[PDB]
Every structure is written in structure tokens, then in C-alpha cells.
Scaffold this motif. Structure first.
Motif, PDB file in Angstrom:
ATOM      1  N   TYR A   1       0.847  -1.174   0.000  1.00 56.32           N
ATOM      2  CA  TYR A   1       0.000   0.000   0.000  1.00 56.32           C
ATOM      3  C   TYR A   1       0.895   1.241   0.000  1.00 56.32           C
ATOM      4  O   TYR A   1       2.044   1.179   0.444  1.00 56.32           O
ATOM      5  CB  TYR A   1      -0.925  -0.027   1.216  1.00 56.32           C
ATOM      6  CG  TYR A   1      -0.243  -0.435   2.509  1.00 56.32           C
ATOM      7  CD1 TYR A   1       0.530   0.471   3.219  1.00 56.32           C
ATOM      8  CD2 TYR A   1      -0.376  -1.722   3.013  1.00 56.32           C
ATOM      9  CE1 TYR A   1       1.153   0.108   4.401  1.00 56.32           C
ATOM     10  CE2 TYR A   1       0.245  -2.094   4.192  1.00 56.32           C
ATOM     11  CZ  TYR A   1       1.007  -1.176   4.881  1.00 56.32           C
ATOM     12  OH  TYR A   1       1.627  -1.544   6.054  1.00 56.32           O
ATOM     13  N   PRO A   2       0.406   2.387  -0.480  1.00 53.96           N
ATOM     14  CA  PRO A   2       1.290   3.535  -0.634  1.00 53.96           C
ATOM     15  C   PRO A   2       1.638   4.184   0.697  1.00 53.96           C
ATOM     16  O   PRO A   2       1.223   3.739   1.771  1.00 53.96           O
ATOM     17  CB  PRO A   2       0.474   4.430  -1.565  1.00 53.96           C
ATOM     18  CG  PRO A   2      -1.009   4.130  -1.146  1.00 53.96           C
ATOM     19  CD  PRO A   2      -0.919   2.962  -0.159  1.00 53.96           C
ATOM     20  N   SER A   3       2.468   5.227   0.613  1.00 54.43           N
ATOM     21  CA  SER A   3       3.088   5.806   1.797  1.00 54.43           C
ATOM     22  C   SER A   3       2.041   6.175   2.836  1.00 54.43           C
ATOM     23  O   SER A   3       1.225   7.081   2.623  1.00 54.43           O
ATOM     24  CB  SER A   3       3.910   7.035   1.410  1.00 54.43           C
ATOM     25  OG  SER A   3       3.089   8.079   0.916  1.00 54.43           O
ATOM     26  N   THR A   4       2.063   5.465   3.957  1.00 51.76           N
ATOM     27  CA  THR A   4       1.149   5.704   5.061  1.00 51.76           C
ATOM     28  C   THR A   4       1.851   6.562   6.103  1.00 51.76           C
ATOM     29  O   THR A   4       2.916   6.192   6.605  1.00 51.76           O
ATOM     30  CB  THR A   4       0.680   4.395   5.693  1.00 51.76           C
ATOM     31  OG1 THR A   4       1.818   3.612   6.081  1.00 51.76           O
ATOM     32  CG2 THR A   4      -0.167   3.604   4.712  1.00 51.76           C
ATOM     33  N   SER A   5       1.254   7.709   6.417  1.00 51.16           N
ATOM     34  CA  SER A   5       1.825   8.653   7.362  1.00 51.16           C
ATOM     35  C   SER A   5       0.853   8.864   8.513  1.00 51.16           C
ATOM     36  O   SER A   5      -0.316   9.191   8.295  1.00 51.16           O
ATOM     37  CB  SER A   5       2.145   9.983   6.678  1.00 51.16           C
ATOM     38  OG  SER A   5       2.824   9.772   5.456  1.00 51.16           O
ATOM     39  N   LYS A   6       1.345   8.674   9.738  1.00 53.14           N
ATOM     40  CA  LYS A   6       0.574   8.944  10.936  1.00 53.14           C
ATOM     41  C   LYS A   6       1.407   9.844  11.842  1.00 53.14           C
ATOM     42  O   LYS A   6       2.617   9.602  12.009  1.00 53.14           O
ATOM     43  CB  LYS A   6       0.172   7.647  11.659  1.00 53.14           C
ATOM     44  CG  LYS A   6       1.315   6.878  12.306  1.00 53.14           C
ATOM     45  CD  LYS A   6       0.917   5.442  12.614  1.00 53.14           C
ATOM     46  CE  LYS A   6       0.770   4.623  11.342  1.00 53.14           C
ATOM     47  NZ  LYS A   6       2.075   4.092  10.862  1.00 53.14           N
ATOM     48  N   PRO A   7       0.829  10.909  12.391  1.00 56.74           N
ATOM     49  CA  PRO A   7       1.603  11.787  13.277  1.00 56.74           C
ATOM     50  C   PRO A   7       2.149  11.026  14.475  1.00 56.74           C
ATOM     51  O   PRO A   7       1.483  10.153  15.039  1.00 56.74           O
ATOM     52  CB  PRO A   7       0.587  12.849  13.703  1.00 56.74           C
ATOM     53  CG  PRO A   7      -0.438  12.856  12.633  1.00 56.74           C
ATOM     54  CD  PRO A   7      -0.471  11.489  12.016  1.00 56.74           C
ATOM     55  N   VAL A   8       3.373  11.366  14.858  1.00 54.90           N
ATOM     56  CA  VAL A   8       4.015  10.752  16.015  1.00 54.90           C
ATOM     57  C   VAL A   8       3.456  11.404  17.273  1.00 54.90           C
ATOM     58  O   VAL A   8       3.413  12.632  17.378  1.00 54.90           O
ATOM     59  CB  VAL A   8       5.540  10.897  15.941  1.00 54.90           C
ATOM     60  CG1 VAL A   8       6.168  10.661  17.309  1.00 54.90           C
ATOM     61  CG2 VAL A   8       6.115   9.940  14.911  1.00 54.90           C
ATOM     62  N   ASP A   9       3.009  10.586  18.220  1.00 56.34           N
ATOM     63  CA  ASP A   9       2.467  11.112  19.464  1.00 56.34           C
ATOM     64  C   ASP A   9       3.598  11.572  20.375  1.00 56.34           C
ATOM     65  O   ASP A   9       4.351  10.745  20.901  1.00 56.34           O
ATOM     66  CB  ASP A   9       1.616  10.050  20.159  1.00 56.34           C
ATOM     67  CG  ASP A   9       1.057  10.527  21.486  1.00 56.34           C
ATOM     68  OD1 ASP A   9       0.011  11.209  21.484  1.00 56.34           O
ATOM     69  OD2 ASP A   9       1.667  10.217  22.529  1.00 56.34           O
TER      70      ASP A   9
END
Lengths: 464, 140, 298, 310, 298, 74, 139
Positions: B32-40
């Protein structure tokens, strides 16, 4: 109805074409080798046929005039004037037009500026396409003439021992113009007998020439007695002339080239410690693409009593790989070039002229940039309360005493060199911890680049 | 495989507060393409200092004030008040540069993000580095 | 071993069974080469890296000679071999090309130790010389079909070029009125033949050499350079207008190229000294172009 | 603490950098005109702007070192040594490194090889890209130095009448290296007084110079009394140095050029039979592209009794 | 401010996560540029004078390096990256190209003050060096897809080129029989890749950079220059005839390029001293071309 | 034609990125060519001293290009 | 694009000066860039003309800020003719290279400010440069 002799020539340097006074024009004491003129270009148009009975005829056209050439030699003659009581060289505007492209201001800090101690010339403000603009006025016997809008191309200084300190000026002008009427009275503007006596009191002899060279990458000062040398200040100024086919043209404007401060220094090979042989062997053993040398050529010598001197200082110099000059006595040549730290920074080098140089004055000129600003000479570091040792987990905020007491930069840095039993901060508050049973040291050096050493061996123990 | 850009040069404005905010984002390259989640940013603190030189014993010009704006969006702001800007302006080098007399070199700065807790490892990380410049102003 | 020096060489042209050793040779240039068929058979099975090259033909050679004028006028045979008709010592440009194929001859380039390079099926394709303020020299250009290395050869002991003719200034006339301010008269003659490649499937696995050729055209041309000179205001004789037909002759003490009727085009250059340049070709119905070869005393 | 004078220089020629003995190194008697050294190349990078307030600053980089240059003059001093009883010139290894690229073998028949009658040098075996390799050792007063891996570029011989027979050597080396420790005892390797007496017994005077010229195409020997001349043995050796932008470089290897043996001979015009005038007139009358002459320049003269000669 | 001097630079090639700092670099040349789409919409309504130009792509960069031979033989990695198979210190030219796409790597050009230019998606497309009477040097040619300016970089402190190898005269052999009178042996190796432009409508209003490429062919070639020398009359070994298959090796003290079977074409030039020129390519069924890299003592 | 000069690390003013619209003027003491809005393309050459080269053309909607001719004293 | 805060002002001798700033907010996401003007609420501009950048420099003059037509974003910065005369008094006697009428009078910069629009003093500099006096002839 008269013939004009070269011996009766008198040269005046001006920054203005009118309103000539003693602050805009002064006489320049020139020598026999003075020369000036202007050459012209031409062209021959010839028909080149091949048949029998060919046309054999030419034709000449004047097409352009070259830039005027002038040159003369003058003695380096520092002295102090009675009016301002500040050391000044008589041909100071020549030095200014060589050094910077701004209006002359001896009170400032760039270009040619003087002081109560010495006359100084630095090239920190020469980033200009057209340096300070002069007008050389020539007086031969009775007739007048001058070169319009001159620029100081270069200044040759030849360190020729058993001879007097002399500088040779060269340059170019837009056009040489003969003047029928007197521009200014040469009797008043020309130097009078009092200042002549003051000047002749101070002469710089090239024989008494000490040289101070130090490798900044190794901290090795060498003792090189010079045999002969030369250094140049070159601007590489080129004069632009327009090309017009119908009318002859004279140069219209100029553009300064690349500022070069090179040199060449000949000396005999010495087997003694830190001699010429050691420098030559180190330079040919390292074989480095770049060198960082500090060169301070001191014309006229250094002495405790007051003596005249002319000093060239190259802080970050570049020294070529030396070669051995096989003569009846073996020697070498140390060709150097003063390069700047950054290309657009200037500060390739500076010069200091005065008739009163004590050794301390030239030392602080070399290490601080000005002969008046004192510089630290020695340091012994002091602890907090005349303490000789330290125990585990104990502070020691050490202080410093410096000489002379009037040095401009009295501050020092802090460092630990030998042993690992303590740490020091910017202020000097040394701190230790447990398990420190070794002898540790502390060092301090000034921020003016003098090269002063402050050392102390503190005997830190494990405690009682 | 590409390079990072840890070296960033900051330019501050005299008499004006300076505000810089950094966002930390988790990234990945997969099927799946680039998955970005904010760092807590929990237990994440910052600390930055400015000195006039890299060499040991350099004078500390000032220090940056650190704060966390949004943990859920992984945004942290690193800035200094106007008084600190004036302090750095006073301690800057007096050597000007032509073609722009405004800018003067002030020194070098570093930023470390750290996570300190009993269960957390004593791990620091120099997120950036570089030099701090000053745009001299005349107002105020 | 034996090296081969250009200065130690001898060029002999073999025509009709007689060797024409062309001495007084200033400089010559030649090359030999082969033609290849190099294909790379990259396939989805094997994306190969090694080509399939076979040498199957000899590339025709282009030999250029620079020959000084001589008192025995052997060099006029190049005009004779190139197709010009001969009457006495004067060479005519025929109205029509005589034959379909050019005049073929062989040429040797001799060297020491029985070393030789044998060019065969040659024909003279270009001859041009510049009458100028330097010594005239005609650069001939011949094309070969087959080159070879041979042990024994033909050496022109008797048929040889004599002493070089002394320099004499050129002069161009219209009838008998001289044209003033000459700079450089350059003459050019060509036999623009073409090789007829007949490489067929019977020559597979063999080296092919060109053998037959046909003449596309012959021509005589001259470019004259003058200085722009006018004697009158609004002059009629000397101007820039084209001249449909005018008798011209580029004359020397030893050679004279005659155009019975010429088509002149003029070109002015605004250089340091104004120069006009002519472009002289014979007209449609002009009589044959003359090329006289005077050895001595006309 | 001492100054070094050129008069106290002593030159030794070696084929080995270690194990120096009397068969690998001998002193070469040099003259005042001895010279050696090594030059360095550099470059200035200058910014050339056009606007007002332009940048005026330069920068220098050391980029390469040139091949070391050395030259000296020696007297042609043939003599016979007591050990081998074969005529030998003291600077014989110089002649060998000039003549051939093989290991020195005086017993052979190519290059520098001697005999019970005369010392001979022929160039029949010089087809090499790197001739015999020497190492010039220089001793000035107390300090030592040497040039690494030298090659004999040429040998100038000037026939200057009313002067002594002399030969001038020139060459190039990879690098000039200063040595702090003594490589070998110069007292032992240097020539002793006995061989010095033997050498000074034999000198070649350029005045007594007869020349023997013969046209091989006509069999005509000429009688030409010389006025002055010179002949050279040239190798046209070029030293290759690599170009590296980051570090300075010294030459790494060389390659010999075209071997040339030219000459020039001046003499007065003589109207006598087979004189200079006859040779000049024959040469300008034939006008031939190639000539076949036999030339035998005999320095020191020819005599019935024993005399030195080159 | 900070100027950028070529002499004060450092070129580091980033492959597999390791930095190959290529010291002993004689000279390098590079350029960066952008592609524009400039159209002028002149209409009958408004015959405008101002174009509609938008920058939409980065023109691929062509970087050329000239690298001296070194004792640690890091420069053989250019053959390794260009596609040659490795066994020990010898590089083979594979019979077939291994993969469709070349071996991609990034390259840095470092300079003072954290200044850098970052070339990405590079591949080695040409490597040729001339074994001659001067010091050998191999000019490599790489093509980039994307160039960028970065602050921090990769610097090869450890992986670096050693001292340059001393000069040694080249020599070409047939089996073990030397070929006389060599002048200049020039070797050439190529990986003639091609960029696959995939600029589509999803890249509108964006700058496009080439990313993927495919190998059209690999090849090994050599041009040998000799002097025309013959030892016998009608010699068989040395002549101008083509040689379909012959074992050749261009040998040095530190490198030896081997053609197990070669196709040689000869070309003679009648210059001051006659020169023959070879054109050596491996045959169809020849074994892989060898390239040995001897550091010291073979 | 310029020399590749940068004043900061990661500078924004001086770089190699294209500039769609930027006011430019090539000024002299006697002439001044003005581009009210310019399209600049940059090209870097890794020569002895790095040189950048601009390609300045007026934009689509830019105001007319000015060419002033000052004889003396502007 | 990038930054173009540096623009030099040429004020006229003996004539009052007034500058009209049309504040704007262009966005190039869509190909025809949005012409949305910023809305001038809780905005104040401050600007002083000070000779040289060194600390302690004397204040040659001070700009007088005018905020008009807040809806469409425009604003005005001005200063009276008396301020112009005070500026021209302290200007240097050296004239500009390109124009022999201008003389360097000092430096300037205007600083926008939001005063507790969201409990934040979001003040940043708008523009900067040098102020040049142009010598008049009428008076």
C-alpha cells in the motif's frame, strides 16, 4: 627657447582638478628612473594583388590612443608631522589609492589611516571597480602637464640589501594633457625645508631586515636571515578604450582586476635549529596542496630604542615549495602569496610605517593589527586563593593575571590538556568528581592571537 | 536510501519574536502507498542552546524556549521571545556583508528531543543543527 | 623491420600498359578500408551482447595528389584521362560526355624493399588549381575500387615529370582588355562519376570490390577574386550586374584557360578593402572550354 | 649551525639504493657549473566579476611537482685500472645508462664495455622505454641528499679548441630526496690519490683535433682542419606526472624519445685539394636529398706514440 | 559569501549504503538544467509577443569523471556497476545483459560549508581509457535523472583510492606473439541505456524527473593504432586482410583486456610514416571479454 | 551569468529552483532594461569556479519590457 | 516568488510623501492564482527611519500609519512634508550612482501587528530597505 632636463622634474599627486590645497596635493620625491608618456595605435591598409603591374601602395590611419603609462620610485620615509602629530608617509595618498576605493579619511580604520604611533595601510575596503582616483601633475622646469584620472596599478618594493628602502609605483591614466598655465604654485605646495629635515632624519635601510615566518599548522617559528627579496601589491587594472573607425579614441574608464600580494625571499641554507634547511625539508616532506604561514617582513630591523621601519604582515600566507639556488654559497627562495581567509573578505595583509618602532610596538602590530593597541606578552594562571592542589568533589574557580596591564584584550579561554580528572567551563569554574587520583592540568590562551601560554599543574589527589 | 537534512540555518528578525514549529510524522513504504501517521509526542521534550562558536568553552549567547503544541497531530514548536532576540542581536558579530548589510552571524545552535521516564530508555537525539543569523531591524 | 616513409615513395600510374611516374609530387594522401555488416541479434530468449559482423566489401579509396607543373607536361594527361579531347597541347571540354563509363587506370604507390600498394579501377574525378601569388599546383582527386598489396610492380623510369615551371603572375582578360586588381584565380574541373554497386547474393562469403562506374556530368568552373575597383562614376564596364555571355580567359605564361562565352555572377564583400568575387561557368551554347599547356616559350 | 659551499660538493653515481660498494657507486669529478634542483607547479583561482563592489581575491593551490633537473660537467679522462688492467673512463656507468637499457656488463659487446686496448660505447642495444636506471648522490659539506631514479637525458660534448676535452651531462629524476644519515662512507668510495695520479696522467686537449670525413657515394676523403665544434647524444626523455586535484603529485615513470646523434663542425675555407672549399662546392652542386658520409671526429689527435684520445 | 571552487571538492558515490569517495580524480565535468514548454499563442485577435513558458521537467544530467588508476582498485567498481560479472579481480563481459534496468546509484559532489549537489538515479554509461605513452586514465560517463541541493551528505572517509599506479608501457599480443610498433591502444566499454520518459497528465503543474531506464546493449571495443610494418615480401602474419577470429590481448603491468576471439578490421593511412589502425570487437561466439585489475606484483 | 554563491545552508533566495514570476532589472548608469515579471531558468556549470546561468524572458501577463536610455546624469 | 521584502523608497524634497499598499493574498494552488485580499482587522503598522543599522542610531524620522478600507485590504503609510524636510536635512552629501539626485538618508522597516486578536502578538516585519531623498528644484 629652452631645453628641458629630467633632473628638474617635480611630481604632485592630486585628487582634484581645481581648488588645489595642501590637503589635496603634495609633492612626491621621485628619482632618476621617473618615466611617463602615452603611445598611439595605427594601422596600414595595403592592397595585395597577384597580376603583373600590381598596385604597390599603403595607407596609414590613426585609430586609437593607448592608456598613459607613468612610473617612478620613492623612498619609504615615515615621519610625524607637526600639524597633526600623527605618523604619516609623504606619499600617503598613493598608498590610499592603492589600498581602497573610498574617499581618503586618515581618521578611519580602512585603507591608508594614521595614528599617534604609526601609519597603517590595510586592504579591507578594496572591493571596488574603480579605486580612489588621482591626478599626477608633472612640472618639468617651466612647462606644466598632467595625466588625467590616474589609478595606482601596482607598487613594487625590492628588498635589496646594502641599499635604502624604496618603493616603485606604476599606473595608468586616461590621457596625458599638457598644461600651459600654472595649476598651483609649486613653491607653496612643495615640501619645505623643515619637513625635509624631519624626513631625512628617518631612513629605512634594507640591510637591517629581520623576517618572522611561522607555520600556523605546526606552530614552528623559523630563523631565516634574508639575502634579498621583493614583494608586490598588484591590482591588475585594465583600461578600456572604445573602438571607433571614424575618429581616434582615448580610454574611457577602467576596471580593477584581481588583487595580488605576492613575494619572493632568498636566503642561505642554515643547518642550525629552525633554519632555512629545516623549513625547506619540512616543505618538501609535507607536500601539501595548501599552506598556512604567517609572514611578517620587517624592513629596517627591530630594536629596543626607536628606529624607522616598514612592516608587511601576511596573516594566512601561502608558501610555494622551495628550491635550492646553487651558487658559490648554497641558498634557497621562499616565494609566498598572501591569500585571504575568504575571497570577498579582503584582509590579505596590511602594512605599518613609522619612525618610532620599539620591539613591543611591532609585536603588537603583528598580533593585534595596530601599533598602538597593546598585546599580552606573558601569563601565569592563578587559582582561587593561592591554592596548590584539589581533592575529590571540590571546585577550583581559577583566575588570570596578564602582562602588560594595558593590553586591550585581557580575556583568556579555558581548556584541559593533560590528564582526565576535572572539567572546566567558559568562566573557569573547574569541577571534579570521585575516583580522580591523577595529576591533571589546566591551560589558558588569550583571544587576541598573541600566542601566550598560561599553564599550571594541579596535584589533585584522592583526598584524606 | 536518500539523504537527510539535519543541517538547517535559521534567520531571525531583530525586535520581532521568532517562531518555528516542527512536525514529526511516521512514514513507511510498503505494498500500500506511503502511510503517514503523526508521532504522538508524549514525554517528548526539546532543548536548544546557542553559542558563538563550536569550540569548547564558547560563550552561550542564549537558549531557546521549548513547547509542544499538539501531541495528537505531532506538532512541536521551538522558538524564543523578543527579548532573547535582542540578547542575541547584542552578542552577534559586528562584521557586515555587502549586498545585504542586515544579516550578521550570531552563532551555532542544536536541538535535542528526548524522552525521559523510569521505563523509558535514556535516549537523546540531535534532530537538527546549523547556524543562527540575525536580520537587524531599525524599528524599536 | 621495414618501416614505410611517405618521403621515400614513388607514385606510378599505369595506363595503356605504360608507367607514368609522376615526379614533382608535393604531397599525396590516401586511405584503405573495408565495409562491414554488423548486426546485433538481441532476442527475448537471449539479450546478447556480441555482434554478428562480417567483412564483405572493400570501401572505395579516395586518393588525392598534389602535383607541381612541369616542363614535359605529363600532368595534362590527368585532363586527358578525365575526359577532355586533345588537339596538340590544348585540351577541350567536349559539348557532350563521350562515353558512359570513365577512363579506368591502375596506380602504384612504390616503397623500398619491394613494398607496394596497388590501387585498381581508378578514375580522375577532380582537378583544381589556384593561379595566385604562390606557385601554382593542381590537386587531382582519384577514386579507386580495389586496393591490394603486391610484391613486384611497374616503375616509370622514362616517363617522368621534368623541372617545375618558374612562377609567373596570373592575368585575366576579356577579349584583350585586362581586368584590374586580381587577387586569386581558382579553376576547377570535375568528372562527377558514381560507383554502380552490384553486390549480389552470388558474392556472399566473399569480399566485393567496386568495378564499374558511370559519368553523371563533366564541368569546368572558375572562381575569380578581385578588389572592388571603379574608374568612373556610374561605370558600365566594372559593376555588379550579371553578365549572361562574355568572352573570358585566365591567362598565364604557361597555361591559359579560355571560356569562349561565360556566365559571370558577382559578389561584393565589405571587408577591409572591398572585394568582388566572380563565378565563371561556360554558357549553354558556348564553344568548348580551352586549356592550353605551354612548356616553354609558349 | 653552518653554511654550505658549492665547492665542497661531491657527486656519486649509483645503480642501487642499498648495499653500496665500489662496483655500484663511484665518485664523479664535477666542476663549478654543477647544478641540481626541483621546481613545483601551482595555480591561482581568481574571481572575475563585472558589477560594482566586485570581489578582488585570489587563492593558490600546489598541484604538482616537476621532474628534478640535474647537470654537471666532467673531463674525458680515459685510463687503465690496476685491478682489471682494462681501459676505463671514471664515469663509465653514466656512459652505460646513456648507451643501453640493460644491466651493466663490461665483459659484453653492447653499451659501455671495455677491453685491454680501449673503452668503447655503442648504442646497439638502446631499444628500451626505460634505460639503465641511476641514482645521483649529492654530498655538500656535511649534509647528504640524492635524486631518486635518474635517467641520462643527454651528454653534451663541446669541441672548444685551446681547452680541455670535456663532456656535460644532463638528466631528470623522479624526486630529489634529502638524506639525514650517511648512505656510504665517501672516503672509501671516493677516488684515492693513486687513481687520481693515473687519471691526471691522461688528459684530452681539444686543440689537437683531427677530423676524418669521407663521402661514401664518391670515395673522397677531405682534409678539413677544424676551428670549433660540438656533438650531442640525446635521448629526448620525457617524464610523466599524474594529475590529481586533491593531492600534489611527483613524476611516476618516464619514456625515452628518439635517439639523436647530431653535430656541428666549423672550419675555414681552404683552396687546397680536398679542402673545405671542395667539400662545400660538391655539397652545393650535388643537391641531394640524402647523403652518405663517414665522419670520425678524433679528439686528442692521432700519433705514432701512445696518446689519449676520444 | 561562499564561492565554490572545483579544486576544493570531493566526489562521493553512494552505492548499497556505503560511500565510495573517488580520490585521485584528475578532472570532472557536470551540468544541471531544466526542461521548459514555451509556446507563443499568437491569434488573429491578439498577435501577442509574450510566450507561455512553464518549467515542468528536469533535464537529465551528464556527469563525466576522469579517474587515475589506483592501487586499491576501487575504480573497477565502475565496471562492476556497469554490468560486468566479477570473479576475483577480473571482470567478465556477460554473454547476455543480466537485467533490463541498469544498476542505479546516487552521487554527491561535496564542497566546503555544507554545500552539496545530489545527483540521484545515476548509472555508468561509458568507460574508456587509452593505453598510450602517457599515464593511463579512464573517463567514466554517468547520467543522472534527478539533481538536488542538500545540506548534509555522505563522505567516504574510509573507502578511497590509494596511490596512483606507476606508468608501464602497453603491449598487445596474439596468443604470445607480440605485435610490433604499437602507438596507442584505446579501449572502450559502454552500457547504452535509455531513459523511459513516463511524463503523464498526473504530473501537470509539477516538476518531472526521470527515474527508470532500460539497457539497450552492452559492448566491449578497442581501437589499436600501429605503424605499417612488414618483415617479409608478401607477408602472411602482418597484412591488411581482415581477421574473422583471432585471440588478442592488450596487456599492461597492471591491466590486461582479453578478447578470446576478435574480429579485426584494418585501415591504412599514408601519413608521414604509414600507420595501420585496427578495429577490435569480440566475435559472435567468443568467450566473455576479460578485464584484469592487478594492483601490484600482478 | 553569475558565480554560484550561497550565503546560508539551504538558502531560499539563491538556489537552482525556477522562478515563475519575479521582477528583474539589468541596470547601468546609462541604460536599464526592466522586466516587470520574469521567468528565470537556472543552469549550473561545475567549472573552475562554479557558475550559474539565468535565462530571463518576460512572463505571459507581464507588463511591457522597459528599455531606458539615459544620456548623462540619468 | 521567494522573498522580496527589500524595496528602496525614493522620497521627494519639498513634497509630502504617501505610499499606498494594496495588501493581498495570492495562492497558486489553482492555476489562476486566487486574488483574495487579506482583511485588515486588529492590524497596526509601525515604521521608523534610522540612519545606519548600528545600535543607538538616531531616529531620523518616523512613519505615520494609516489604515483605510480594511475590507479590501489596502493601507497607507505616509509622513508630512515637515518629516520630509527633517529627513533631507540629515541625508548624506554623497549621491547615488545611478541617479545623481538621490542621497542615502537612512534605513527603514514596517512591522505589521495583531494585538490580541487571538491573545497573540503576531507582529512580523513587512518590508525593508533604504530611504533615498531626491533633491528638488522648485523650492
Amino acid at each position: 627657447m629652452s631645453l628641458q632636463l629630467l633632473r628638474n622634474t617635480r611630481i604632485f599627486v592630486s585628487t582634484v582638478k581645481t581648488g588645489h590645497n595642501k590637503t589635496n596635493t603634495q609633492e612626491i620625491l621621485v628619482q632618476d628612473d621617473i618615466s611617463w608618456g602615452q603611445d598611439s595605435n595605427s594601422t596600414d591598409i595595403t592592397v595585395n594583388e597577384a597580376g603583373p603591374r600590381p598596385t604597390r601602395g599603403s595607407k596609414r590611419f590613426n585609430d586609437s590612443l593607448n592608456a598613459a603609462e607613468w612610473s617612478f620610485s620613492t623612498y619609504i620615509l615615515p615621519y610625524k608631522d607637526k600639524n597633526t602629530s600623527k605618523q604619516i608617509v609623504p606619499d600617503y595618498m598613493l598608498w590610499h589609492a592603492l589600498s581602497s576605493g573610498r574617499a581618503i579619511n586618515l581618521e578611519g580604520t580602512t585603507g591608508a589611516h594614521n595614528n599617534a604611533t604609526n601609519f597603517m595601510v590595510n586592504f579591507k575596503d578594496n572591493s571596488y571597480h574603480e579605486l580612489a582616483m588621482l591626478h599626477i601633475y608633472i612640472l618639468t622646469d617651466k612647462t606644466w602637464s598632467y595625466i588625467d584620472s590616474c589609478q595606482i596599478n601596482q607598487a613594487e618594493v625590492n628588498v635589496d640589501i646594502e641599499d635604502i628602502g624604496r618603493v616603485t609605483w606604476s599606473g595608468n591614466g586616461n590621457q596625458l594633457i599638457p598644461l600651459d598655465e600654472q595649476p598651483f604654485d609649486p613653491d607653496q605646495i612643495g615640501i619645505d625645508d623643515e619637513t625635509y629635515m624631519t624626513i631625512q632624519g628617518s631612513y629605512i635601510k634594507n640591510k637591517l631586515t629581520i623576517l618572522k615566518i611561522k607555520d600556523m599548522d605546526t606552530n614552528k617559528s623559523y630563523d631565516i636571515p634574508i639575502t634579498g627579496g621583493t614583494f608586490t601589491i598588484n591590482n591588475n587594472i585594465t583600461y578600456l578604450t572604445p573602438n571607433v573607425m571614424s575618429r581616434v579614441t582615448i580610454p574611457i574608464g577602467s576596471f580593477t582586476g584581481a588583487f595580488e600580494l605576492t613575494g619572493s625571499l632568498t636566503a642561505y641554507l642554515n643547518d642550525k635549529s629552525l633554519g632555512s634547511m629545516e623549513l625547506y625539508k619540512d616543505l618538501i616532506k609535507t607536500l601539501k596542496v595548501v599552506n598556512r604561514f604567517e609572514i611578517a617582513l620587517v624592513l629596517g630591523g627591530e630594536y629596543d630604542d626607536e628606529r624607522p621601519a616598514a612592516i608587511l604582515v601576511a596573516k594566512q600566507a601561502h608558501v610555494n615549495i622551495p628550491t635550492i639556488e646553487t651558487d658559490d654559497v648554497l641558498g634557497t627562495s621562499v616565494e609566498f602569496k598572501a591569500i585571504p581567509s575568504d575571497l570577498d573578505a579582503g584582509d590579505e595583509g596590511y602594512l605599518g610605517f613609522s619612525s618610532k618602532y620599539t620591539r613591543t610596538t611591532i609585536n603588537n602590530l603583528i598580533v593585534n593589527g595596530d601599533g598602538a593597541t597593546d598585546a599580552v606578552t606573558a601569563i601565569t594562571v592563578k587559582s582561587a586563593g593561592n591554592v596548590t592542589t584539589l581533592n575529590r568533589s571540590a571546585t577550583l574557580q581559577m583566575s588570570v593575571e596578564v602582562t602588560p596591564s594595558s593590553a586591550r584584550n585581557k580575556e583568556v579561554t579555558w581548556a584541559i590538556t593533560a590528564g582526565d580528572a576535572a572539567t572546566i567551563n567558559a568562566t573557569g569554574l573547574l569541577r571534579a568528581d570521585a575516583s580522580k587520583t591523577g595529576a591533571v592540568t589546566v591551560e589558558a590562551t588569550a583571544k587576541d592571537g598573541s600566542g601566550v601560554k598560561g599553564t599550571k599543574v594541579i596535584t589533585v589527589t584522592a583526598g584524606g | 536510501m536518500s539523504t537527510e537534512n539535519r543541517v538547517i540555518d535559521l534567520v531571525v528578525d531583530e525586535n520581532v519574536p521568532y517562531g518555528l514549529l516542527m512536525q514529526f510524522m511516521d512514514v513507511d513504504d510498503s505494498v500500500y502507498p506511503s502511510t503517514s501517521k503523526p508521532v504522538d509526542l508524549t514525554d517528548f521534550s526539546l532543548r536548544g542552546s546557542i553559542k558563538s562558536s563550536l569550540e569548547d568553552g564558547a560563550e552561550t549567547v542564549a537558549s531557546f524556549t521549548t513547547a509542544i503544541v499538539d501531541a495528537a497531530q505531532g506538532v512541536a514548536s521551538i522558538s524564543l521571545p523578543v527579548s532573547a532576540v535582542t540578547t542575541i542581536a547584542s552578542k552577534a558579530s559586528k562584521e557586515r556583508d555587502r549586498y545585504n548589510p542586515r544579516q550578521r552571524l550570531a552563532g551555532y545552535y542544536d536541538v535535542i528531543i528526548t524522552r525521559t521516564a523510569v521505563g523509558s530508555a535514556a535516549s537523546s537525539f540531535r534532530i537538527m543543527e546549523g547556524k543562527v543569523y540575525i536580520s537587524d531591524g531599525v524599528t524599536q | 623491420m621495414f618501416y614505410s616513409l611517405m618521403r621515400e615513395s614513388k607514385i606510378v600510374i599505369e595506363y595503356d600498359g605504360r608507367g607514368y611516374h609522376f615526379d614533382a609530387l608535393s604531397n599525396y594522401d590516401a586511405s584503405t578500408s573495408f565495409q562491414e555488416f554488423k548486426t546485433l541479434r538481441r532476442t527475448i530468449h537471449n539479450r546478447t551482447n556480441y555482434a554478428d559482423s562480417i567483412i564483405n566489401a572493400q570501401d572505395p579509396s579516395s586518393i588525392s595528389l598534389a602535383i607541381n607543373f612541369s616542363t614535359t607536361l605529363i600532368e595534362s594527361n590527368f585532363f586527358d584521362w578525365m575526359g577532355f579531347t586533345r588537339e596538340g597541347n590544348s585540351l577541350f571540354l567536349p559539348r557532350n560526355t563521350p562515353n558512359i563509363e570513365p577512363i579506368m587506370f591502375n596506380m602504384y604507390i612504390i616503397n623500398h624493399n619491394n613494398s607496394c600498394i596497388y590501387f585498381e579501377n581508378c578514375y580522375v574525378s577532380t582537378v583544381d588549381f589556384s593561379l595566385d601569388k604562390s606557385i601554382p599546383i593542381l590537386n587531382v582527386g582519384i577514386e579507386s575500387g580495389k586496393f591490394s598489396e603486391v610484391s613486384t610492380f611497374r616503375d616509370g623510369y622514362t616517363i617522368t615529370q621534368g623541372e617545375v615551371l618558374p612562377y609567373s603572375a596570373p592575368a585575366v582578360y576579356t577579349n584583350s582588355s585586362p581586368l584590374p586588381a586580381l587577387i586569386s584565380a581558382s579553376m576547377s574541373f570535375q568528372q562527377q562519376c558514381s560507383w554502380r554497386e552490384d553486390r549480389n547474393i552470388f558474392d556472399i562469403n566473399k569480399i566485393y570490390t567496386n568495378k564499374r562506374a558511370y559519368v553523371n556530368e563533366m564541368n569546368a568552373s572558375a572562381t575569380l577574386a578581385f578588389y572592388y575597383v571603379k574608374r568612373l562614376v556610374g561605370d558600365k564596364f566594372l559593376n555588379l550586374d550579371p553578365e549572361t555571355r562574355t568572352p573570358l580567359i585566365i591567362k598565364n605564361k604557361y597555361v591559359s584557360i579560355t571560356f569562349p562565352l561565360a556566365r559571370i555572377s558577382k559578389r561584393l564583400n565589405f571587408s577591409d578593402l572591398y572585394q568582388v568575387e566572380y563565378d565563371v561557368i561556360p554558357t549553354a551554347d558556348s564553344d568548348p572550354v580551352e586549356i592550353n599547356f605551354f612548356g616553354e616559350r609558349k
